[PDB]
């Protein structure tokens, strides 16, 4: 049965959910591991899943008496449609995908993202524990001079409350975490400090990989998932 | 140009906003003024103002190109749409309404409900000042035994936030609000205390309208929206 | 064995039944022959084994005064919530018995509501004190309120948003208990369930009974007892 | 004519500036010839002019313990809130001056950051206070962080998180002050005065500058002794 981790963001936007959900996408393939991926856009778009699409595949599933005269409404309407969706997409490659890497787009925080993160919260319980991840990016600013943890814990607090607890906190910086910065996030985060990931400004995104592997992602992530 | 009173619910549903707006409605009819209505119901069904209209409307927008390429978001986009929906109704009879209430259904603090009390925290700013009220139902529990004040207190310091501050506070009781408990209510919640409106228990909901009456609410209106 | 501590805290009102829901857990677990304390924490500025907010600080505040803090900045977070938490050691270690031994459990009844300002130095003392003593040996009761409105059916609003508050101060409860009036159907506890996160099971109901004595038997009725043995692996 | 009150917040981040904005507005007014007074808050317990956690509640302790409230239940609200508005009250009022005519101004410096355990209670005393002092009287400026990313667009999500929670926290923001390092675009003020609840001209962008000293002038420039004369009604 599959495997899931979900990448979500906190703070700001261009904060590198891309760069992380690839790199983790491709530090798991150079496993012998099968990895797929799926983007969430919380966008009204229908143009890879979409709030436009879901709200579409709902409204017109609706409007031909699929859901017997009674309310659609969020939950659980469109979070089941969306907890469907995710998973039809883990599984398209003839061997199937054995891990899915979810990056979901915009911020945890905004009105876009509700039916998102909560469709998550109920997917964790429904799919087991070993098969379901969470990595929350956040910025960790510094203006030169002290490295900022107040964000990551406010953006932390505020997905716990939304039902979900990060397994890594990776952390943008411009200059690595001090172990002490890090020691301080771990205590308000939950996670313990090597769960505690800073990808810090490198020249060039190949290294992105090659900073989350030496931090022990490719270990934790076996142990974590159960994996090959 | 047009007068609006939005009436939103807390706590718990089945709280009887939809019997204050009509109370509200029928109070103010009965000054030679022409009311009208808009029953906003969160849910996604298409069958008054539904999300899944609201986003159909926004989603086939889009299909065609009417947003020019980029990308459509709740905020702006839907709540645009939901703004100007509100306009059009609000007009709608052969002389013009003069007042409108909206009764927006859901409880603060549902996912639901967001894209609606985002779309009237812009649009109090929009139509001036003395044309926009905002009423919030709210339970006032009491096993017996004392009235328990906090869940207003948690609703109302929720709907501030997502940026609507209560004009009236009206008070779902079943014995009459103690004037030291709608001081308190008072003293948390901003308005002053004749703004505290309790609704008891009554035998019957004829009673609503004069129990808004006799606590003022007829004249508050007036003053309130400047109104003949 | 190590040390077992069960956590009571309140939400939606004030009164909602803490302090009785505190001491039938009390007399449940010492019905079966385990060596049971309680601590209880009022969250009042007021100066055992019932700690306060002034009794706290004033504690802090010597010591500071004292140079214990070796000259360096002293705060709620850590020095107020350190203090909350070797308060909490100290007491639970005191017998309270036929003869001297350690105490097997610990029940803490905090006062006030989860989302007060008065409750949050306390709410975040114990978000820490369950990672020191391991969240095996800890344990958390959240009770609420679940309204019922004769405009038939039963609430769980204010119970999910106080869950959701309280997880977010980073707590997330083992029980939850909900007091109404009549008992809960039990799709209305699986609603619970599936939005705070414990199973159906651990969704408890408290409605109104004709004693306060009759409440102890409510719980043990809902399999509260054998939760807690398997919850906190207690003979 | 009545004490005018200035309360400088903090948010996103610690180490934002407060206290260079706060002595800038201060430098500033004075600049006019009003005669204005300071007051800074640490909300930490160490034990003027310069209010702290361990000051207030050790009054407060003091007070219950010496039987001053009569034997009720005494609280963080209304009781120690209560301590914080009567010593700004107090403060406010004495001179500071050439000769002694009551200070026209008070620039209220608060520690901590918005959301932070150890402001809470400071920040619930300053939203009662403001209805006390009529809010003609009184005049919040929040300082805020406008991070800017070279993956180069100026970031507003933080600025309105943190006035959204410092708005359902009771206060509303009269003046939104940006830390940024370039100045940020008319536009991204409109933005926030958008989502904040105050016109783009009530955005103030204090950017990167070659010395503190700079600042004062760069609020001077952005028209704020204006906006000072005109929203608490200053000669």
Redesign the interface.
């Given at each position: 049965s599959m495997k899931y981790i979900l990448v979500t963001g906190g703070?700001?936007?261009?904060?590198?959910k891309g760069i992380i959900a690839s790199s983790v996408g491709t530090i798991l393939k150079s496993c012998g591991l099968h990895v797929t991926s799926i983007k969430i856009?919380?966008?009204?778009?229908?143009d890879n899943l979409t709030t436009?699409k879901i709200?579409?595949y709902?409204?017109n599933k609706?409007?031909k008496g699929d859901y017997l005269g009674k309310?659609?409404?969020?939950?659980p309407?469109?979070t089941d449609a969306i907890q469907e969706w995710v998973m039809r997409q883990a599984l398209i490659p003839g061997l199937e995908p054995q891990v899915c890497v979810i990056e979901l787009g915009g911020?945890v925080?905004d009105?876009?993202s509700?039916?998102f993160i909560?469709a998550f919260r109920?997917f964790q319980?429904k799919v087991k524990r070993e098969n379901f991840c969470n990595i929350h990016v956040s910025?960790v600013?510094q203006?030169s001079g002290?490295q900022?943890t107040?964000?990551t814990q406010?953006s932390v607090?505020?997905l716990?409350?939304?039902?979900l607890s990060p397994d890594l906190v990776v952390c943008r910086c411009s200059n690595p975490l001090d172990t002490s910065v890090k020691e301080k996030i771990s205590?308000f985060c939950?996670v313990e400090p090597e769960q505690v990931i800073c990808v810090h400004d490198v020249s060039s995104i190949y290294r992105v990989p090659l900073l989350l592997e030496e931090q022990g992602v490719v270990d934790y992530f076996l142990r974590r998932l159960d994996l090959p």
């Open positions: 703070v700001i936007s261009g904060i590198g856009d919380p966008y009204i778009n229908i436009g709200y579409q709902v409204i609706e409007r309310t659609v409404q969020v939950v309407h469109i911020t925080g009105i876009e509700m039916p909560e109920q319980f910025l600013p203006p002290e900022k107040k964000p406010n607090r505020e716990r409350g939304l039902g205590m939950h």
